[PDB]
C-alpha cells in the first residue's frame, strides 16, 4: 500500500575552525554567495541516484544569517526539514545532515530578509553519502 515517508530528524552541529573553512572554500568562486539586503538565496541540491544522505556546511564573514532546509518532491510538495532560524555562522562553522526521505531536491535557504543595511557573504559546501 502507499504510505507517507517518515522523515528523519536532521542533525546540526558546529566546529571551531572557521578561518580554515573559508580559506578552503575561497579557492572556488561558485562556493561563495553574496546575499544582498532583504534578500533570500536558495541553493538547490538534488538527491543523487546513489545517495543516502546530504551533508552541508556554511559560514559567513561578519554577521549572522537565517538558515533553513526544505525538501522538494519530484505545485510540488515541500517539507520543512530545518526550520529557518538565524545562526551565528560568522563565529563558527555550521554543519548538519539529513537522510534522504526519497527522490527530490533539497533547498538550502540563506535568509537575509531581516537585514535592512547589510549584505552577507556565504561560504558553503555539500557532500552526499551512499
Amino acid at each position: 500500500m502507499e504510505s507517507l515517508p517518515v522523515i528523519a530528524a536532521p542533525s546540526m552541529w558546529t566546529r571551531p575552525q572557521i578561518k580554515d573553512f573559508k580559506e578552503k572554500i575561497q579557492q572556488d568562486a561558485d562556493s561563495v554567495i553574496t546575499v544582498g539586503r532583504g534578500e533570500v538565496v536558495t541553493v538547490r541540491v538534488p538527491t543523487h541516484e546513489e545517495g543516502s544522505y546530504l551533508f552541508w556546511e556554511f559560514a559567513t564573514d561578519n554577521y549572522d544569517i537565517g538558515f533553513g532546509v526544505y525538501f522538494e518532491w519530484t505545485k510540488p510538495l515541500l517539507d520543512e526539514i530545518v526550520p529557518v532560524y538565524r545562526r551565528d555562522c560568522h563565529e563558527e562553522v555550521y554543519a548538519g545532515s539529513h537522510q534522504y526521505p526519497g527522490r527530490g531536491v533539497y533547498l538550502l535557504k540563506f535568509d537575509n530578509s531581516y537585514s535592512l543595511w547589510r549584505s552577507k557573504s556565504v561560504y558553503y559546501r555539500v557532500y552526499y553519502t551512499r
Binding site: 552541529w13 544582498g36 536558495t42 541553493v43 538547490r44 554543519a95 557532500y127 552526499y128 553519502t129
Partner: protein, 43 residues
C-alpha cells in the same frame, strides 16, 4: 564501506577538514561540485 548513519555519527562528533578529507578519500562522502548547483535569488 560503513553505513551512512555511521559516517554521520563520526562527522557529528569529531568533525574536521582532516576527517572530511579522509572520508572523501575513502569515497565515504562525495562532494557536490558547487558549479552544478542551481542558485536562486529572491527579495
Amino acid at each position: 564501506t560503513p553505513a551512512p548513519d555511521a559516517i554521520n555519527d563520526l562527522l557529528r562528533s569529531v568533525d574536521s577538514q582532516e576527517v572530511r578529507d579522509y572520508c572523501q578519500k575513502k569515497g565515504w562522502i562525495v562532494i557536490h561540485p558547487s558549479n552544478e548547483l542551481v542558485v536562486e535569488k529572491h527579495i
